[PDB]
Design a protein around this ligand. Structure first.
Ligand SMILES: [Mg+2]
Ligand SMILES: [Mg+2]
Ligand SMILES: [Mg+2]
Ligand SMILES: [Mg+2]
Ligand SMILES: [Mg+2]
Ligand SMILES: [Mg+2]
Ligand SMILES: [Mg+2]
Ligand SMILES: [Mg+2]
Ligand SMILES: [Mg+2]
Ligand SMILES: [Mg+2]
Ligand SMILES: [Mg+2]
Ligand SMILES: [Mg+2]
Ligand SMILES: [Mg+2]
Ligand SMILES: [Mg+2]
Ligand SMILES: [Mg+2]
Ligand SMILES: [Mg+2]
Ligand SMILES: [Mg+2]
Ligand SMILES: [Mg+2]
Ligand SMILES: [Mg+2]
Ligand SMILES: [Mg+2]
Ligand SMILES: [Mg+2]
Ligand SMILES: [Mg+2]
Ligand SMILES: [Mg+2]
Ligand SMILES: [Mg+2]
Ligand SMILES: [Mg+2]
Lengths: 233, 68, 121, 252, 56
RNA sequence: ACUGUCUAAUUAAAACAUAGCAUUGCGAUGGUCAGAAAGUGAUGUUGACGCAAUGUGAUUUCUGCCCAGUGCUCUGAAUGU
RNA sequence: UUACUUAUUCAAUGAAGCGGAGCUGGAAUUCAUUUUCCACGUUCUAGCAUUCAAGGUCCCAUUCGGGGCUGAUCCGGGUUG
C-alpha cells in the first residue's frame, strides 16, 4: 500500500520479455532417452500379434500382493542360514550318525528359467509366475502356451525385479511353487483359482486378439472430431 | 530347459510373432551407433552354442555393415 | 507425484563426482634429484680478454652457463655459490651452442676482487 | 582427351564464390510464436550495399521476446523502405511495403518479394534486383496460394509461406550497357571466376567437343540430349526449339 | 588508441550529462522529448479506448 | 572495331578476349558440375535484373528461302517391334 | 484408385508456447436453450522494456534475509512442420 505500487506486466506479444515458464515438454533430450521413449511408442503404433500382447494383460495389484505375501514365506536359504545349517549337519550327521539328515526337507520357491521349464514339463509346478518385462521376450513367451498344455496354472506378473527380490537376486525371469507346507495349501488353492480365472481360462480367446494399432493423441483428436462432424452435422 | 525352445522359435522368421520383433528391433539398432556395446545377447541360445558364457570377461558387441 | 520443473530447453551433462587419484603403487619409486643446481647452472668462467675487461671496468662477471637455465636460475646460483649481490643479468647464446651470462654485481661488491678470489686471471 | 571446362567447375577449386566482403546471408526472421499468431515490430537501422549483389540489403533489428537483448536480421531491401522505418512481421499485420505477411493474409494482386517456398525457409523466390511475385489466387480449403514467379511460371504454395510486400530495390540495373571489358571484369571480380569465356570452337579437340578443324565450326548439331553424359553436354542442352524467337513472348 | 583509454583518468572518457561518453547531446535531447511525449500519448491512448469500450 | 591477351627458348598476327547481339537449360523433391562411397561436395553468404551452357563479335544497316537428312524436342499416336 | 503414420525422406529451432478443453466477449436466430462460427493485451514518433515481477496472499517464529501460491486457467509430456 504505502510507497508500494501495482505495476503489472503485459506478456502480450511485442512487450515485456516472457517470464520463465516450464519448458519440460519442449526440452531436447539425450538420444538414449529419445529412443527408449520412441521404442515404447513404435510398439504401440504397430499391430502386435496375439502370442506377444497376451502379455500387457497383467495381474491386478491386489491378487498379486496376496501372491507375493504367500511366496515370501517360501524364500530360499540366505547365505548365513546355509552356513549355519551345514555346521549343524556337519557335526550331527558325521557324528550322531543320522544319514544325511540333521536337516528337515526344505520348502522354497523354485527359480531360474531352465529350472522352471523342466518343472512345468514334468508337471511338478503348482504355480508359475512370469514377468512382464524380459527384453529378449523369447525367453518367456512360450511359457503360457507351455503351461496351458501342461495344465500348470500360471500368471503374468509385473516386477521381474520384484520376482527377483523374493528370491534374493537382482532380478528373476520366473518364480514357481511346487511343494507347499500343509498349513498354506488352502491359501494357494484360492490364489490358483483367481489366477486361472484371469489367465489360463482366457488363454484361447486372448490368442485370437491382436494388440496395438493405437494412435497418439494429436492424431486421435484429429480423427475423433473428423468422424464427429462428417457423419453427424 | 528354455534354450531348446528359443532355438526352434528362431527358425520361424516369417512367423507373425518374429516379423513383429524383427521390425521393432531393427529400427532401434539403426538408431544407435554403427558399433555399440550390447548389454546382453539378444539371442542367448545362439551365443550359448557359439561359446558364450555368463562369466565376467565375455563381451557382446553389435554392429552394422552396408549391403550389396 | 509430478515431474521435475526445467525452465530451459537445453539438457546438459549432469555435474557428477570426480574422485582424486589414490594409487595402489608408486609412480617412479624414487624422486629425481634436482636436475639443475647451482653447480650445474654455472659451468665455467669466461676468461677471454674482452671478458676480463668487463670485470675490471664493468663490475661484471662473465660465465659460461647451462643452456637450460634462465635469468632467475643464473642470478640465484651466482648469488649462492659466490656470496654476492646481483644487480641484473643479461644473457645470450654464443654461436658454438653455449650460453653466456653477463652478470653485473651491486655497487657494494667488486667483481675484480671476486674474480681472483675464485682464482682466475 | 582433356576434361572440359564445365566439368572442372564442380570440384570448386578456383571456381568457388568470392565471399569475403559479403554482409552475410539475407533471410527472413525465424518463424516463431510472434510471427504466426501476432505481428512483431522492427526498425531498419540501415540499408546497405552487398558485394556481388544487385540489390541493397536492409539491416532490421528486433527485440528478443524470450530474453532481454536486441536481435538483428538481414533483409533484402524492398524499394521505398527507408532508415528509421518500422517493419511489421506476422500473421496479423497491416499491408504495407516493407512488412512481411503470410501469403494467405494478402488479397490477390498483392505484390511481394523474398517469398518462402515452404513456410519457414526464410525466403527463396524473387530476391534479385527488380523482381517480385504476384498472388494470382487462393484455395482456402487446403489453404494454398497460387503465385506467378519472375520466370513466368505459376506455382502453388502454402498460404503460411511468408513474403514481403513490395518489389526488390535497385531495378533497371541491366538497362545500362557495360560498355567495356573492364566493367565486366570488376563485375565478376566480386562474384566468381566465370569471365572471360573462351569459345570451344577456338579450342583443340582434347579440350572440347567443338574443338578442332581447319575452319572454326561445330561440325555436328549443337543441340544435346538430356541423356547426354558429362563431357558431352556443351552447346544447347535439351533445346525444344532453336533460332531467333519471332513474335510475342509472354505465356498465356 | 583503444588501450591507452585504460591509462587515462575517467574525466577524459566522459561528459557530465546522462549518456555522457556515448550519445551526442542533441541526440539525448531528442530521446527525452520522444520518451516524454510517447509516455503521455500512452495515457491518451488508454483512456480513449477505455471510453470506446464503454460506448459502442 | 577499339584498350587488352598467347606460342618462356624460330610465329604478337588478320589468332584469343572484349562490350554489344542471339539462342539453350533450370522454381530447389531443381539446372550444370564433383566423388569409390557417404548424414559427401562446387554454383550457394545464391533464386530468373539469377546461376549454368553455346554461338556471333563495337556502332549503322540488314539478317531471305529450305524441317527431306543428321541432331534436339513434344499437352501427340498405338496393336508394329 | 485415396486415406492413415510409426518405417523411410526433407526443412527448422541455443527443440518456446503444439494438440484438446475451459474462461470471458461478440457476430449470430433462438423454434427450448444454445445448434454453432469467429475472435479472446502490441501500428501517428529513429525513446524506454533485464535482477525467479511489482501487487496480493500464506508461511519461517520475526532481522537482515528467505520460501510457497497467485499474478501467468486446465489437460496430454508428439520439439514444430
Ligand atoms: Mg557385466
Ligand atoms: Mg636475448
Ligand atoms: Mg565458400
Ligand atoms: Mg578467369
Ligand atoms: Mg562467348
Ligand atoms: Mg569468347
Ligand atoms: Mg587453335
Ligand atoms: Mg572429343
Ligand atoms: Mg559430338
Ligand atoms: Mg571443330
Ligand atoms: Mg564458325
Ligand atoms: Mg570530459
Ligand atoms: Mg547514475
Ligand atoms: Mg594494342
Ligand atoms: Mg615463340
Ligand atoms: Mg603486338
Ligand atoms: Mg617473337
Ligand atoms: Mg554488330
Ligand atoms: Mg549415410
Ligand atoms: Mg574474334
Ligand atoms: Mg558474348
Ligand atoms: Mg529479301
Ligand atoms: Mg518459295
Ligand atoms: Mg530438315
Ligand atoms: Mg522448435
Amino acid at each position: 500500500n504505502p510507497l508500494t505500487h501495482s505495476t503489472p506486466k503485459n506478456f502480450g506479444i511485442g512487450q515485456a520479455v516472457q517470464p520463465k515458464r516450464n519448458l519440460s515438454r519442449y526440452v531436447k533430450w539425450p538420444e538414449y532417452v529419445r529412443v527408449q521413449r520412441q521404442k515404447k511408442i513404435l510398439s504401440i503404433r504397430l499391430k502386435v500379434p496375439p502370442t506377444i500382447a497376451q502379455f500387457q494383460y497383467t495381474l491386478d495389484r491386489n491378487t498379486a500382493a496376496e501372491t507375493f505375501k504367500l511366496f515370501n514365506k517360501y524364500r530360499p536359504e540366505t547365505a548365513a542360514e546355509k552356513k549355519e545349517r551345514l555346521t549343524k549337519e556337519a557335526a550331527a550327521v558325521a557324528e550322531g550318525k543320522s544319514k544325511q539328515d540333521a536337516s528337515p526337507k526344505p520348502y522354497a520357491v523354485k527359480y531360474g528359467l531352465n529350472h522352471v521349464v523342466a518343472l512345468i514339463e514334468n508337471k511338478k509346478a503348482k504355480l508359475v509366475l512370469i514377468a512382464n518385462d524380459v527384453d529378449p521376450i523369447e525367453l518367456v513367451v512360450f511359457l503360457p502356451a507351455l503351461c496351458k498344455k501342461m495344465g500348470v496354472p500360471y500368471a503374468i506378473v509385473k516386477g521381474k525385479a520384484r520376482l527377483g527380490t523374493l528370491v534374493n537376486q537382482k532380478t528373476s525371469a520366473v518364480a514357481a511353487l511346487t511343494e507347499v507346507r500343509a498349513e498354506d495349501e488352502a491359501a494357494l488353492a484360492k490364489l490358483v483359482s483367481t489366477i486361472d480365472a484371469n489367465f489360463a481360462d482366457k488363454y484361447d480367446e486372448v490368442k485370437k486378439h491382436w494388440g496395438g494399432g493405437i494412435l497418439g493423441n494429436k492424431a486421435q483428436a484429429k480423427m475423433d472430431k473428423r468422424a464427429k462432424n462428417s457423419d453427424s452435422a | 530347459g528354455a534354450y531348446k525352445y528359443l532355438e526352434e522359435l528362431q527358425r520361424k522368421k516369417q512367423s507373425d510373432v518374429l516379423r513383429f520383433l524383427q521390425r521393432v528391433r531393427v529400427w532401434e539398432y539403426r538408431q544407435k551407433n554403427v558399433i555399440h556395446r550390447a548389454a546382453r545377447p539378444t539371442r542367448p541360445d545362439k551365443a550359448r552354442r557359439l561359446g558364450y558364457k555368463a562369466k565376467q570377461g565375455f563381451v557382446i558387441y553389435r554392429v552394422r555393415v552396408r549391403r550389396g | 507425484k509430478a515431474l521435475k520443473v526445467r525452465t530451459s530447453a537445453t539438457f546438459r551433462l549432469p555435474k557428477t563426482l570426480k574422485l582424486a587419484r589414490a594409487p595402489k603403487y608408486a609412480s617412479k619409486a624414487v624422486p629425481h634429484y634436482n636436475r639443475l643446481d647451482s653447480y650445474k647452472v654455472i659451468e665455467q668462467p669466461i676468461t677471454s680478454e674482452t671478458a676480463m675487461k668487463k670485470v675490471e671496468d664493468g663490475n661484471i662477471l662473465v660465465f659460461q652457463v647451462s643452456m637450460k637455465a634462465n635469468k632467475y636460475q643464473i642470478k640465484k646460483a651466482v648469488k649462492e655459490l659466490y656470496e654476492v649481490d646481483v644487480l641484473k643479468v643479461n644473457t645470450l647464446v654464443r654461436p658454438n651452442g653455449t650460453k653466456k651470462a653477463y652478470v653485473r654485481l651491486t655497487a657494494d661488491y667488486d667483481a675484480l676482487d671476486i674474480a681472483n678470489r675464485i682464482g682466475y686471471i | 582427351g582433356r576434361v572440359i571446362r564445365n566439368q572442372r567447375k564442380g570440384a570448386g577449386s578456383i571456381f568457388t564464390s568470392h565471399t569475403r566482403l559479403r554482409q552475410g546471408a539475407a533471410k527472413l526472421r525465424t518463424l516463431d510464436y510472434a510471427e504466426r499468431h501476432g505481428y512483431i515490430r522492427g526498425i531498419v537501422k540501415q540499408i546497405v550495399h552487398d558485394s556481388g549483389r544487385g540489390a541493397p540489403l536492409a539491416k532490421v533489428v528486433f527485440r528478443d521476446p524470450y530474453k532481454y537483448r536486441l536481435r538483428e536480421e538481414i533483409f533484402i531491401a524492398n524499394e521505398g523502405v527507408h532508415t528509421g522505418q518500422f517493419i511489421y512481421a506476422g500473421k496479423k499485420a497491416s499491408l504495407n511495403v516493407g512488412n512481411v505477411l503470410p501469403l494467405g493474409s494478402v488479397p490477390e494482386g498483392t505484390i511481394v518479394s523474398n517469398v518462402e517456398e515452404k513456410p519457414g525457409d526464410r525466403g527463396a523466390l524473387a530476391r534479385a534486383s527488380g523482381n517480385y511475385v504476384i498472388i494470382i489466387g487462393h484455395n482456402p480449403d487446403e489453404n494454398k496460394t497460387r503465385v506467378r514467379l519472375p520466370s513466368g511460371a505459376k506455382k502453388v504454395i502454402s498460404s503460411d509461406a511468408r513474403g514481403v510486400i513490395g518489389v526488390i530495390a535497385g531495378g533497371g540495373r541491366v538497362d545500362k550497357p557495360l560498355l567495356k571489358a573492364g566493367r565486366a571484369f570488376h563485375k565478376y571480380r566480386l562474384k566468381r571466376n566465370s569471365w572471360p569465356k573462351t569459345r570451344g570452337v577456338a579450342m583443340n579437340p582434347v579440350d572440347h567437343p567443338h574443338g578442332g578443324g581447319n575452319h572454326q565450326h561445330i561440325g555436328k548439331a549443337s543441340t544435346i540430349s538430356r541423356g547426354a553424359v558429362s563431357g558431352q553436354k556443351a552447346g544447347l542442352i535439351a533445346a525444344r526449339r532453336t533460332g531467333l524467337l519471332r513474335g510475342s513472348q509472354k505465356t498465356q | 588508441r583503444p588501450r591507452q583509454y585504460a591509462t587515462v583518468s575517467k574525466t577524459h572518457k566522459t561528459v557530465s550529462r546522462a549518456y555522457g561518453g556515448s550519445r551526442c547531446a542533441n541526440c539525448v535531447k531528442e530521446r527525452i522529448i520522444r520518451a516524454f511525449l510517447i509516455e503521455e500519448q500512452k495515457i491518451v491512448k488508454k483512456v480513449v479506448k477505455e471510453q470506446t469500450e464503454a460506448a459502442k
